[PDB]
């Protein structure tokens, strides 16, 4: 009806007016959704579509059932997004047809960049190889990046300092600037897997164990003593599945590893802007 053509028209005018509004917050989805099928969508054909573990930038709220935002991927058009409420409905109306974990996790508007490997942090080889990358980033993305240290154990996400650091990370990402964390306690992807930080794990992967072993020897007797715990840490990371990391710096030349990481962060920047 007539009053329906105005609502849809206006709904669509709210959708476009929001096209350039600030990113209120972000969510990582825990379920898939096919909005192109959702008939109740305020505007036929404006429903977002996403698989589980995707990221969404919420611009504004339309109603209790719908938000307005977009998928965090290049060419991510603004759209209507079902709220946890509406998703719950849908989850139940598909339950009755067969004869609690939330649909969304609120995450930082920019996923925290975190480095792991080639081995244990605290030792010269890993610390220096990662230091070289932090310096490169401080330079390549100067003007739109924040690189900060976190000594608090984030994998716990003292429990007060941890909370305070979680909040600090959210604040840093609010401006949509790149956020890189030099987190001393994170040596393995699984240590952040159950947090709500949804980091961009960058694996600095040394080709072979023989090589890493010789890099350690290059450091001197002091480092060589802790040879066994560095090699084990290396084995654990290497025994991890690919999907466990977002970026795998595979190259043996620093500048190539840097360009790899930069290309990736540049695609991310376009995706979030």
């Amino acid at each position: 009806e007539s009053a329906r053509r105005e609502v849809e028209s206006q709904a669509q005018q709210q959708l476009e007016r929001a096209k350039h509004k600030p990113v209120a917050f972000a969510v990582r989805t825990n379920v898939s959704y096919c909005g192109v099928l959702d008939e109740e969508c305020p505007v036929q054909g404006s429903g977002v579509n996403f698989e589980a573990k995707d990221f969404l930038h919420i611009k504004e709220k339309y109603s209790n059932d719908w938000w307005i935002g977009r998928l965090v991927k290049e060419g991510g058009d603004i759209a209507f997004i079902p709220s946890p409420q509406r998703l719950e409905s849908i989850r139940l109306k598909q339950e009755q047809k067969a004869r609690h974990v939330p649909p969304y996790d609120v995450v930082p508007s920019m996923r925290p960049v975190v480095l792991v490997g080639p081995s244990l942090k605290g030792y010269e080889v890993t610390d220096m190889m990662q230091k070289a990358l932090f310096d490169f980033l401080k330079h390549r993305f100067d003007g739109r990046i924040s690189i900060t240290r976190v000594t608090a154990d984030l994998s716990l996400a003292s429990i007060a300092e941890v909370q305070s650091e979680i909040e600090r990370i959210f604040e840093l990402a609010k401006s949509l600037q790149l956020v890189v964390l030099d987190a001393d306690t994170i040596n393995h992807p699984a240590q952040l897997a159950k947090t709500s930080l949804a980091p961009i794990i960058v694996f600095v992967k040394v080709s072979s164990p023989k090589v890493l072993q010789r890099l350690i020897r290059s450091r001197g007797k002091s480092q060589m003593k802790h040879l066994t715990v560095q090699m084990m840490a290396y084995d654990k990371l290497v025994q991890c599945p690919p999907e466990s990391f977002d970026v795998i710096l595979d190259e043996n030349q620093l500048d190539d590893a840097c360009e790899h990481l930069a290309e990736y962060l540049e695609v991310y920047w376009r995706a979030t802007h």
């Binding site: 220096m128 070289a132 080709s207 030349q253």
Partner: peptide, 25 residues
């Protein structure tokens, strides 16, 4: 034997060492 592994080791070592020395700056 397997002179390619030896070559590979020399290539990776040299690169990774330079990577480390660059951070020593």
């Amino acid at each position: 034997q397997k002179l390619r592994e030896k070559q590979q080791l020399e290539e990776d070592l040299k690169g990774y060492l330079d990577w480390i020395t660059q951070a020593e700056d």
